[PDB]
Amino acid sequence: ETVQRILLEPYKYLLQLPGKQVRTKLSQAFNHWLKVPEDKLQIIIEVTEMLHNASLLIDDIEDNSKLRRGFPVAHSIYGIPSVINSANYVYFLGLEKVLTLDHPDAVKLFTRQLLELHQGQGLDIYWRDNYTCPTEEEYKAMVLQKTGGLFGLAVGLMQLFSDYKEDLKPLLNTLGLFFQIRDDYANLHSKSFCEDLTEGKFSFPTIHAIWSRPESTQVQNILRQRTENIDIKKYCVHYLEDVGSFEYTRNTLKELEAKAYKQIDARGGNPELVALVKHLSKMFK
Amino acid sequence: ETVQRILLEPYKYLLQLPGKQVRTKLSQAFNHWLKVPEDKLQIIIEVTEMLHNASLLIDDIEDNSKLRRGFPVAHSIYGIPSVINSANYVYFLGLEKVLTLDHPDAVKLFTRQLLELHQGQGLDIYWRDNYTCPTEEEYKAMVLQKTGGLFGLAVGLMQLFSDYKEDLKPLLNTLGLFFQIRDDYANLHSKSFCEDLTEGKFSFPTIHAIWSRPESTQVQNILRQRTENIDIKKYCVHYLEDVGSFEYTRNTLKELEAKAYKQIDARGGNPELVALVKHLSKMF
Amino acid sequence: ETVQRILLEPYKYLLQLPGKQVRTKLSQAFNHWLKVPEDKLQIIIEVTEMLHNASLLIDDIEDNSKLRRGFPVAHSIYGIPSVINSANYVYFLGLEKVLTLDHPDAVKLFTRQLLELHQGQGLDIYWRDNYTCPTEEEYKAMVLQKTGGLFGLAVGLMQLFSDYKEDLKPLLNTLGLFFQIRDDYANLHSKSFCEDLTEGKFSFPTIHAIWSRPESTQVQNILRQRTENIDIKKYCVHYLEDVGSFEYTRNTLKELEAKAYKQIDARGGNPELVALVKHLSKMF
Amino acid sequence: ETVQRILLEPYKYLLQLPGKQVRTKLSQAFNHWLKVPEDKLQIIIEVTEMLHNASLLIDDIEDNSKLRRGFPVAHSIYGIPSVINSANYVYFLGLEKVLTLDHPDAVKLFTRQLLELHQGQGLDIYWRDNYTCPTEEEYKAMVLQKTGGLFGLAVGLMQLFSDYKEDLKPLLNTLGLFFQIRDDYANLHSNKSFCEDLTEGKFSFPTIHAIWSRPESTQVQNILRQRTENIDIKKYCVHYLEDVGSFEYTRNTLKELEAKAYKQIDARGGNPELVALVKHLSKMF
Amino acid sequence: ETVQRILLEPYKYLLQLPGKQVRTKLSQAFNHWLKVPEDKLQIIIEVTEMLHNASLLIDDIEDNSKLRRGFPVAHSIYGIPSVINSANYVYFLGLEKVLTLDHPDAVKLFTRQLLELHQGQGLDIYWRDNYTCPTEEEYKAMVLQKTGGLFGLAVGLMQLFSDYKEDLKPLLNTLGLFFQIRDDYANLHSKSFCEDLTEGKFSFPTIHAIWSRPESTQVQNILRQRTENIDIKKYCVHYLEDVGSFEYTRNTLKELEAKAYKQIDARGGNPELVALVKHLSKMF
Amino acid sequence: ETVQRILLEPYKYLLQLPGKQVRTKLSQAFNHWLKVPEDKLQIIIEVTEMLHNASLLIDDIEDNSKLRRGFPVAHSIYGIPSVINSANYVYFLGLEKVLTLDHPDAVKLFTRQLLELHQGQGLDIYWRDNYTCPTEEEYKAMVLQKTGGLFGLAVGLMQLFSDYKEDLKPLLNTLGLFFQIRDDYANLHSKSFCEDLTEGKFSFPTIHAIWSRPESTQVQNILRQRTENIDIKKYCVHYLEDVGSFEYTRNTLKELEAKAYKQIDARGGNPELVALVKHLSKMF
Numbered sequence A: 001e002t003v004q005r006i007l008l009e010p011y012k013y014l015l016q017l018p019g020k021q022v023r024t025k026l027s028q029a030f031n032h033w034l035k036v037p038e039d040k041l042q043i044i045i046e047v048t049e050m051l052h053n054a055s056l057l058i059d060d061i062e063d064n065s066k067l068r069r070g071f072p073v074a075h076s077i078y079g080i081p082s083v084i085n086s087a088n089y090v091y092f093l094g095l096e097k098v099l100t101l102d103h104p105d106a107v108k109l110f111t112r113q114l115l116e117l118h119q120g121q122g123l124d125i126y127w128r129d130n131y132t133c134p135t136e137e138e139y140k141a142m143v144l145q146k147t148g149g150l151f152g153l154a155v156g157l158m159q160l161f162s163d164y165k166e167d168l169k170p171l172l173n174t175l176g177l178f179f180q181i182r183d184d185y186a187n188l189h190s191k192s193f194c195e196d197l198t199e200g201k202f203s204f205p206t207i208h209a210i211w212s213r214p215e216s217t218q219v220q221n222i223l224r225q226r227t228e229n230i231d232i233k234k235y236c237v238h239y240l241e242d243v244g245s246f247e248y249t250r251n252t253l254k255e256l257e258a259k260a261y262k263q264i265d266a267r268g269g270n271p272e273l274v275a276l277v278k279h280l281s282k283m284f285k
Numbered sequence B, C, E, F: 001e002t003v004q005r006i007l008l009e010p011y012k013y014l015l016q017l018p019g020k021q022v023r024t025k026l027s028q029a030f031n032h033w034l035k036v037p038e039d040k041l042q043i044i045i046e047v048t049e050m051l052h053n054a055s056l057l058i059d060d061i062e063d064n065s066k067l068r069r070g071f072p073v074a075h076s077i078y079g080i081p082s083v084i085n086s087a088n089y090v091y092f093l094g095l096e097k098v099l100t101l102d103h104p105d106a107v108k109l110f111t112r113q114l115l116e117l118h119q120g121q122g123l124d125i126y127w128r129d130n131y132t133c134p135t136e137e138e139y140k141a142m143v144l145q146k147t148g149g150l151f152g153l154a155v156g157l158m159q160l161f162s163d164y165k166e167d168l169k170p171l172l173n174t175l176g177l178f179f180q181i182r183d184d185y186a187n188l189h190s191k192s193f194c195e196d197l198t199e200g201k202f203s204f205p206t207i208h209a210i211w212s213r214p215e216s217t218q219v220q221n222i223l224r225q226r227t228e229n230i231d232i233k234k235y236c237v238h239y240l241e242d243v244g245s246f247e248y249t250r251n252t253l254k255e256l257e258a259k260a261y262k263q264i265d266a267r268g269g270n271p272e273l274v275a276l277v278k279h280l281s282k283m284f
Numbered sequence D: 001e002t003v004q005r006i007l008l009e010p011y012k013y014l015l016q017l018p019g020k021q022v023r024t025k026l027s028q029a030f031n032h033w034l035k036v037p038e039d040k041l042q043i044i045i046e047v048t049e050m051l052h053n054a055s056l057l058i059d060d061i062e063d064n065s066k067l068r069r070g071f072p073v074a075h076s077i078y079g080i081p082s083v084i085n086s087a088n089y090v091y092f093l094g095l096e097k098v099l100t101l102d103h104p105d106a107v108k109l110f111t112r113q114l115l116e117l118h119q120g121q122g123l124d125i126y127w128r129d130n131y132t133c134p135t136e137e138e139y140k141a142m143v144l145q146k147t148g149g150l151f152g153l154a155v156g157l158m159q160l161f162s163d164y165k166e167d168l169k170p171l172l173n174t175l176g177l178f179f180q181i182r183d184d185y186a187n188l189h190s191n192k193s194f195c196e197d198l199t200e201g202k203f204s205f206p207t208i209h210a211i212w213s214r215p216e217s218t219q220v221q222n223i224l225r226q227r228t229e230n231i232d233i234k235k236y237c238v239h240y241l242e243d244v245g246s247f248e249y250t251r252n253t254l255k256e257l258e259a260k261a262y263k264q265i266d267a268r269g270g271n272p273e274l275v276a277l278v279k280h281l282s283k284m285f
Ligand SMILES: CC(C)=CCC/C(C)=C/CC/C(C)=C/CC/C(C)=C/COP(=O)(O)OP(=O)(O)O
Pocket: A023, A026, A027, A028, A030, A048, A052, A055, A056, A059, A060, A063, A065, A121, A146, A147, A150, A151, A152, A154, A155, A179, A180, A183
């Protein structure tokens, strides 16, 4: 049974990548409130990691990405077919691990949240490949489905074993939108160079440019080319800057940071979470 | 939420393709022993259909196929990204259907059987993409995992609601192997022309041809070309025929048919299932 | 200047293709009413030939076609750069020839009709390449511009030298739509097999299918694949038939043919033209 | 009819590029001689601009170019099919504009000049794509038809509304060559990306010289045939042009031409604004 | 050393292909005059085959060919790198075999002929890939280098051990040209469909079409495309036929056959060769 | 015959590359021992040069390389077919020059060494393209055949006209390995960036990485990609450094260097060759 080794090799590859430090901080922060017992908390952490990583392996294939956090994407080393099988294998390894929580609502919640993630991803993929730019409201809505999938899996499972009956769903929605838009910004403003444009996807900045200059189809046409061409990409970033789309993403990110601090105090404060949000906000201005 | 409609369009497309008749027949066949109550049986039939199709959606991306049962492969119409997301989605819709059985071991078994399916696909993919031809025993072993995933799911779930506690795994193993090698044989002997050679996969007839003639590295090299060229395929089938690898697969399918019947009689017989196995065996 | 020979070779090649006997019948059919003097009429006949062929040479590059009227498309032999320059050269040889009519409103009309052609094609290309399926009204609208460009050029230049001042634009619009929709139908129902589906374009049958079954985005996605794959094409033609798109197209064509006859008897009859219209109608 | 907006978008995209400044200067300079009424002169400039730009849009497609004056080429944003049609439309917008001059010979001359432009491009494309290298005299001969197409249109139309009876074709020929050869040098020696002319496979002045100058080598012909984007082959190729003296040869041709333009300007009684432009454009070598 | 088996597999693959039966018939034909001992003659036949086959392996890589004598070309199965090394290896096995003749001129001749073979191939490729169509006299002269390379090795080695010193080079030239031009005609008239067009090579009929019709650059342009499109090829074969290229080649082949009979009868006749040339000539 | 000009162009090109200066310093180093008369020695150096260059022309095609010693590979300028022919031609021009030595064992040795070389080459190719990584010892064995091919031809031919009967093959083997492994290290540790990974080849450092960490299939999968992607290459190089493969290669090269010195002292010393080896060692 070194079948398991071969099957999990693409996953193990991805564990080299950065990302666990922030996932750890989030669990610790939210456990400040939920006060979940050590044994259940670790199964929940393990499970979160597996599903998150499983879904990143798949997103990279859906998105024809080249790098992730400075590293080549699993499937550019091992191939698409091996990575798909492996990611899916790992999803069901997660489900197996969830059953070790031995709580009758755990699998019910796991299903709900994985169904929600797939709706978020579905829409993203749908808009891109059928060339229908979403409205800003549509976009935010699917980001809450995408990111609320894993956000709400983690805190939902924790809640099964917590006495903390205050409402976190609003705060999770803010942090979801925050991570995603922050990501959308980073990708086009500083993964390799402007991958989101090669992907052809509609991210926060490109959406803004599209609706801000409706006589133009320039961004749409560029996204449709799925181009690796550095000069086209450069021209496009120059264009978003002119139309004020980076500006508008910056301000959207400042408001979401404000709201996060507002929502955290509403729950009595959480210094560790404020620290992480302040640290993650460094990446504008 | 006409989003649901969009997310399931690849799945709905695939429900047009032939297949249900034989999945339906098996369910009736096994329920002659298992005698599952009607409300639980439909939930099971629905769940089997979803997971089976979902895995086909993916297998075709994994395998780069062009046709399935005479239809274009889903992703050749809606694109890979969409089809992956939609197959994975239906997996979970399947999990959610399974919770409605309201049996404490249903999920446990569901999990076990998918892990297996995936351990089986893993190896198929691994050997193909890393150019390690499996031995016949290794090949058979993973088929039992690949097919055993779903066969064992359908029947495992049924047994949760049954007082038939006899062991059906040996029979499922034979059926699994029978379906797969049948498949393998049809593919290269009668999907479009020899898709398995274009996929580069090791199937029963080529596994035999490789180990049978170790002077020659010719079939390995042809697989590795992942070619659509019909003249290369024709040459290859001609070689498989000459080394008697189609004869060998026929004699393996004949042994399996006959083992099916003996494992069915060991269980108290089943006309319905013997009909299915005889009907499927006309192909050799 | 045997440069003239190299520059014009692509155009010369295109003149081996069928299509003149139709252009000639129309010329004669309208001249029944217009009764243009021979000297002017021959110049017009030549101008219409140059501009039409020049525009087809470009359409084939725009549309990525492989064959026209059973013959390889010009650029497939001579390459795209040489064809673009050649077609454009011929446009201006067209203009130079229009100048030999010596009618002050000649160039003015010529300019207007070519601008109109480019509007129709501009929309065709746009919808296709930015993936926006037109409503049926929108589509008819651009066909009128596309076909009307050269239809109206030929008859326009003729009417400058005629005493026949009755209005032919309604009849030409009916003839425009008729030729195009007929084209659209023959392309998908009987150029190589279903080239329009490989082009990715939206044609009358595919337009119907898309608004007729709004749950399904299937035709959109096939058009988006720009595929040569014969099975996808077969699958698509099967769907258009199931949803009633070919029937629908055949009805539109019938109403237009009817309307053609009404607009001809509106003008005082034209047996040469009713002949061409009945002949071209045999196709459905 | 927003149809015109879609039609004109690629053309509008090209109008962002540099190039108008030099066109404006030449119009002013030749009007020192031709003294064309400003009503007519505006119309002529607008027509010059339309046809010039339309012909670049097309040339970029013909020449598989990636940049022009530092910008992506229109067809790389909007697709080949859209820009062919857009460009062709603009040609006929051009014709329509020319008719607003109300001169019975305006269109005759329009036609004559585009037909000549088209002969020039024809030979350019032909030699490249049928792998026949032209002689230097052959090349110069076509450059006069290509560049003389548009020069002769601007100045020919102007002459329709002028009493200036002195002959300008020789000076325009000299300018034709100067601009084109200057281009050919800049392209390989220094807007367009690295050595695009090599990737095109075209026979330009320095390659032409290097081919006949060393008939025992077929290495330049063969590199041009490869249509390569490989930066090493291109670097290798420019080394060879420099070793064989093709860049020195081009520089002296360009000096000879600059001298001729000054002598020819002087025969027409001087033109300080044209000398300013020639002198400015000569800094380049 | 099972390295040898792997090293030689591509070569052994090609030994399945038709082509031996003629090479033998020839050897027998010339031994009718040269009367070589059968210990030397066998070693010579073995050297002929090795160098011919090895040179065909390379020619198929050079010419991007898909089939040879109905079979897939070696490198389409084993990959170019392996076949390049395998062919070169067999060249030096050939020289190894040549040394076992112990003739002190064997190697001098061996070298002259391969050097000559390579100057012919070199010219074929140079014209093709730098797009310079050769004149008819230029073509024929390289065909004499290309075919005479091997023809002149077989017979030149045989003559080292013969008391027959009457000159055979004029007959070997006639034969060389007879074989190649027969080939060129079969390719474009009856390997899969018109591969010589896909290759882009200038063959005897394409050469006639080009110079015969110097206004047209249609055949040059089609060859430059390096296309697999059945229609462009079809169109092309039609053009060659209309321009009379196929007639012209039939007559050139007729005249060589006659010149073959006169040069054989010049040498005292040779029924067994008049037999093969007759047999061959049936094809026009 | 300007034929020889065209045919030799790819060769003549490659002579622009650095590499002679080492080949000349080797000749002199060994001629300190062998003391070969000058007319014979010049012929040997020319023969060495031709066959070494001809073989590099083929290697670059086999290995799908872009650069060699900072210049473009021949076939990227002239195309693959022309270089294949030009390379093989030079081989036989080399056989011809060999015959000018007038030694009855010259062609026998020539043949033995080229055969030897093609055996090494074929194995490198075999492993790469059939995805069987060799063992360190296997690899070392084929390197001896590959490099020994040419090394042994130079020194073997020199020895035919030498009174020096001491055994050199142990020192040639040490050098052969030294040269190749030093190449394998440069290639990955400092040709464009890590061309070896794009090629897919198993070179000393990657072989170490593969066996050093058998749970991982990461280096194999990377090599399988035949990638140009700089990020995958960078990743890979970091991985090799983490597994200690560059240290490992460095210590092997240090062992080979010191062995060389022992072997040279065994033969009486050779300052010129010590100086050469010392210089080549500055690179680790
Ligand atoms: C509640 C606690 C303690 C932890 C939860 C921490 C987790 C699991 C966070 C994940 C939230 C998130 C950002 C999910 C998105 C996953 C996903 C499907 C990403 C793909 O989005 P893209 O838009 O394609 O961008 P990338 O390709 O750059 O990832």
